[PDB]
Amino acid sequence: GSLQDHIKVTQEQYELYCEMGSTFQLCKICAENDKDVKIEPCGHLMCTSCLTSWQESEGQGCPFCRCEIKGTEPIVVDPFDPR
Ligand SMILES: [Zn+2]
Ligand SMILES: [Zn+2]
Numbered sequence: 001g002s003l004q005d006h007i008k009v010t011q012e013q014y015e016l017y018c019e020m021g022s023t024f025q026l027c028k029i030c031a032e033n034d035k036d037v038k039i040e041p042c043g044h045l046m047c048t049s050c051l052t053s054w055q056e057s058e059g060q061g062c063p064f065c066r067c068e069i070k071g072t073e074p075i076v077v078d079p080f081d082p083r
Pocket of ligand 2: 044062065068
């Protein structure tokens with residue numbers, strides 16, 4: 001009945017089934033890598049890709065804020081839907 005609008009699935013009408021929400025992934029410094037390393041006891045999150053580079057430039061604190069770097073641990077966050 002009335003749900004049949006006069007259109008056609010020429011290419012595709014129902015392709016719009018993607019949400020595209022919030023990407024919980026990614027490192028702010030590079031945007032390509034994700035939060036792989038957590039700087040302790042700072043609690044800052046980024047990828048070792050950026051962090052090593054910064055320490056190769058003397059790791060005078062996190063690359064952003066330059067706050068306390070003592071230790072580092074791996075992260076690996078949950079993707080869920082990074083689409
Ligand atoms: Zn990065
Ligand atoms: Zn920090």
